[PDB]
Every structure is written in C-alpha cells, then in structure tokens.
C-alpha cells in the first residue's frame, strides 16, 4: 500500500529505488529534524526512512505484529530492531537550512566516536576517516539531499543529490557495520535526532503489519 | 578521471551511483535528442550515458585500446560493444520539453519490435508490456528524469526522478536481454536517437583507455 509524505517542502516518494541497492524500498517514515535554540524549534533538515520492500515487515512481524502505533513508539527494542534488521535500509536527508559537509560529518561522527570511546577499533577510525573525507569538499543548499544506503552487511553507500539527475557518488562504499548502523541510529535511536521520524515510522509500520492479516 | 557535463541546463555528474547498482558509474558521454522543425532545431531530451567504473574500461580496452577517438566514432562495432559489454551500464533521460509515460514507452517499443518483427520470442512481448505498464501512469514535465539501469546479463531497472529526493521506483526489474540492450542502443546504436551522445562517448572513452593503458 503505502503513501508518499511531505515534510516542510520536501516530497518523499512512496516506493523508491535507492542508489547502491538492488531492491525497491517503501517509505517507512518521515519527519523534521531540528534544534532547540533560545526556546525555539528551528527546523534544519527533513529526514525520510525507507525499508526493503518485502524483507522488512516479514522480518519485523515476528516480534511486532499486532502491536499498535503507541505501543511500537514506546518501545526502544522496536527501533533497535529496525536499525539492526537483517534487511536493507535507506535514509534521505534533505536540507531546509544550509549545512556544510564538514560540520555534518563533524557531529554525526563525534558522537559515534564518543560512545565507542566509552566502551572503538582501528576499523572504526578508518571508516570515520573515509566518511568525513567523503564529506568535506561538499556543500548543501536548501533542497540538496544526502542519500544513505544501509545494506544488510554493514556497507554504507553515500550519494549526494542536488537537482534531479542521478545521485552523485560520495566516494567508495564504506564497509563498517558499526558506522553504517550508527548513522541511522543517530536518527532513530534512543536519543534519536528526529523524534518526528520515529513517530511517523512506528505508526505506518503498525498499519502495514496489521494489513498483512488477510 | 572524468568531467561534469552540462547539456542545455541539465547537469550530469562525472561519477554516479545509479539505483539497482552496487557500483559507481562514470559519465561516459552526454548530448541532446534533437529534431528539425520548421524554422529551428528543437531540443527534446538531454541524455547521459554512464558505464561501470572499474569494469567498462577493462572490457573495452583490448579490442579498442590504442585506437583513436576518430576510429571509435566512425565504427558502429564499438557502440555495439558498449551496448553489449559484460559490465553494467546506466542511462539518464531528462526532459526539458514535456512528455508522457505512454508517449515515451511507445517511443521505444515499436522500433525494437520492428527489428524483432523481421529478424520475436514471447519473453520480448511480455517484457514489452511490463515496460509499457511500468510507464503508463507517469508524466514527465521539464526537468524530470528517467533512470535506466542495465545489468550485464540484461536485467533492466527503471526509476523516475522529478526532484532531489531518492528516485521513485518504476516497478519490478525487467529481465530480458533484447529489451535491456535495445533501450540503450536506441540512444547510441546505428540509428541512435542522440548522435551527440555517441560523439561525446567516443571522445571520453578513448582518452580513458589511453589513460588506463599503461
């Protein structure tokens, strides 16, 4: 089934074919990402979350079938299950405000870094280095998108999309399951950077799970 | 290394990550689809042809290395080798003059099955109707793009892009070598709709094989 959603101006297609992926993805959820400055919620980006067209839902249904929107929303194990699921995920980050690749890299990376510090090998450091070198000569105006593909393997594909042409390569694919998962968890995790996305996601997947029961 | 190509407004990235593909592709060449009408020369389409980054150069290099761009542009066998090669290709079709899903579908359908008419196994008829239906309810204003991915064995992945978002799916992949190859040969083949794209292609690929050949 599944519908297309519009966050701010950004329009997210219902069914998609991501770069670096052989399968179609359905729009699982979408929502604004912003900051709290001076007691005001400034919107920075619009995030869309896509899941593998049939792998996901079948996979989720085993622990989450029957459960409702609020129930799924109130459970961290759910969002960790979609983050870690044995299927392809995809994330679209479209800009409302302008960001630079350096700053973006800087604190999607530094928090993964910090956490891994607390418990972080050389594979992690290398993956991070490839990530930010992928990002530091780039610019993102309003409308510019970042396309993240999270393959079931831990391979992270990075594409960029100003305008309507083919997504442009962000470099070589980065094969590091911790970073690949972490990029997505920064969004949907427990201290997920976009609560709106999580709510939408939970609601829609709930609907899809009930619909299976013919 | 390659360069970005601008074609009446449409920007083609030098290094792309197409949907349906694990690999990066390099912009092999790009040019308009044009046609003489009355007073002037009307631009219909802007087409970009991409080849699998690592593999294309290697596969083409032993029949066509050393050979000059002159020689390539002149010989149809070369373009047959690009169409037929054991590497994956990608092509982007960008409007900049409004067309329908229908209009384009049947743009390509007959000519293939005209060829197939004379020299037509069901698999082609079925594939043709899956293609046709994959397009039927879509509409392409100026700026919109069709994104075709051709795997080595001839499975065709279709996507659409009217913005900076992740490409929207055109449905299930179409597995048929004749049609998959036909879609690209319609562009760079003997009766190839865009001569300019071939010229560009020969020019760039020649320098690439020289570069890579020692």
Briefly characterize the structure.
Two copies of one chain form a homodimer. Chain A is an alpha+beta fold and about 210 residues long. Chain A has helices spanning about 55-60, 60-65, 70-75, 75-85, 100-120, 120-135, 175-190, 195-210, and strands at about 5, 10, 15, 25-35, 40-50, 90-95, 100, 140, 145-150, 155-160, 170, 175.
In words, what does this structure look like?
It is classed as isomerase. The entry lists the keywords Chalcone isomerase, Deschampsia antarctica, isomerase. 2 copies of one chain form a homodimer. With 214 residues, the first copy, chain A, is α+β, with helices and mostly antiparallel strands. Chain A has 2 domains: 1-55 and 85-187, Chalcone isomerase (3-Layer(bba) Sandwich); 56-84 and 188-211, 10k-s Protein, Hypothetical Protein A, Chain A, CATH 1.10.890. Chain A is 39% helix and 29% strand. In chain A, the strands form 3 sheets. In chain A, strands 3, 4, 5, 6, 9, 10, 11 and 12 form an 8-stranded antiparallel beta sheet that branches. In chain A, strands 1-2 form a two-stranded antiparallel ribbon. In chain A, strands 7-8 form a two-stranded antiparallel ribbon. In chain A, helix 4 runs antiparallel to helix 7 and helix 5 (101-118) runs antiparallel to helix 6. The first copy, chain A, is globular. The relative contact order of chain A is 0.20. Chains A and B meet through strand 2, strand 3, strand 6, strand 10 and strand 11 of A and strand 2, strand 3, strand 6, strand 10 and strand 11 of B.
């Amino acid at each position: 089934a599944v519908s297309e959603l519009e966050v701010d101006g950004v329009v997210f297609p219902s069914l998609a074919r991501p770069p670096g992926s052989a399968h179609s993805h359905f729009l699982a959820g979408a929502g604004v990402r912003g900051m709290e400055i001076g007691g005001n919620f400034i919107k920075f980006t619009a995030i869309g979350v896509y899941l593998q067209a049939d792998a996901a839902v079948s996979a989720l249904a085993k622990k989450w079938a029957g459960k409702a929107a609020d129930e799924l929303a109130s459970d961290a194990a759910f969002f960790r299950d979609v983050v870690t699921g044995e299927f392809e995920k995809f994330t679209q980050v479209t800009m409302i405000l302008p960001l630079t690749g350096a700053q973006y890299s800087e604190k999607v990376t530094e928090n993964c870094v910090a956490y891994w510090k607390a418990v972080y090998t050389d594979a992690e450091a290398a993956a991070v280095d490839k990530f930010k070198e992928a990002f530091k000569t780039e610019t993102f105006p309003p409308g510019a998108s970042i396309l993240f593909t999270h393959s079931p393997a831990g391979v992270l594909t990075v594409a960029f999309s100003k305008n309507s042409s083919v997504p442009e390569s962000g470099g070589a694919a980065i094969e590091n399951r911790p970073l690949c998962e972490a990029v997505l968890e920064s969004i949907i995790g427990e201290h997920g950077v976009s609560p709106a996305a999580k709510l939408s996601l939970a609601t829609r997947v709930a609907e899809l799970l009930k619909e299976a029961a013919s």
